[PDB]
């Protein structure tokens, strides 16, 4: 695992989700299809930044962006179901 990294992920997962929360479903009239594209564009950005901050060896590093990329997924999916059903209200 390796702490520096593990923590970097925690920091990420939070900052990411802060962003998800600052999203006001009304103010931003967008499409289901489009929203998916947007959260997609968002995580890519995160995996990009944090990759620049991640630390050390490959077998350890790139592995991290795996969790980071997954835990982001795990967060976005819910947020998407929301907007999913929100648009349908």
């Amino acid at each position: 695992l390796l702490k520096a990294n593990k923590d970097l992920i925690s920091a990420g997962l939070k900052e990411f989700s802060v962003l998800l929360n600052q999203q006001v479903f009304n103010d931003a009239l967008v499409s289901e299809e489009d929203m998916v594209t947007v959260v997609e564009d968002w995580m890519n950005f995160y995996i990009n930044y944090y990759r620049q901050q991640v630390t050390g060896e490959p077998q350890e590093r790139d592995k991290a962006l795996q969790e980071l990329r997954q835990e982001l997924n795990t967060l976005a999916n819910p947020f998407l179901a929301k907007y999913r059903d929100f648009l349908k209200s």
Binding site: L29, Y49, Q52
Partner: protein, 126 residues
């Protein structure tokens, strides 16, 4: 509409500086690519790569954005379906983050998202 946010915005843009126009166009382009159906609303304009209209409208959205920055009085600063403005902003972010991967920390990013989501609104709240 945080003050910290305000510091991030001025900073980020100031870094942009001389590339606002270029970035304006680049953004529009990403929109037409990431949101294909966006093109549809436009059959009387050149949406081709390098179109002059796009190059022109990029400079517009830039210059505008710059102002909207000085007066962070935006609804005192200043048809077409709204979603274009929402999506333009999104891409605008992407564009900035891709040209300034250094300056855009998960925070500065979120601080810009908000900023562009408002400028987005003062436009289509119209």
């Amino acid at each position: 509409l945080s003050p910290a946010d305000k510091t991030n915005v001025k900073a980020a843009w100031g870094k942009v500086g001389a590339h606002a126009g270029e970035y304006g166009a680049e953004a529009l382009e990403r929109m037409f690519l990431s949101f294909p159906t966006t093109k549809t609303y436009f059959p009387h304009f050149d949406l081709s790569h390098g179109s002059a209209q796009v190059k022109g409208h990029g400079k517009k959205v830039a210059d505008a954005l710059t102002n909207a920055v000085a007066h962070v009085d935006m609804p005192n600063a200043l048809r077409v379906d709204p979603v274009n403005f929402k999506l333009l902003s999104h891409c605008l972010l992407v564009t900035l983050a891709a040209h300034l991967p250094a300056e855009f920390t998960p925070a500065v990013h979120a601080s810009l998202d908000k900023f562009l989501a408002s400028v987005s609104t003062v436009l289509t709240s119209k």
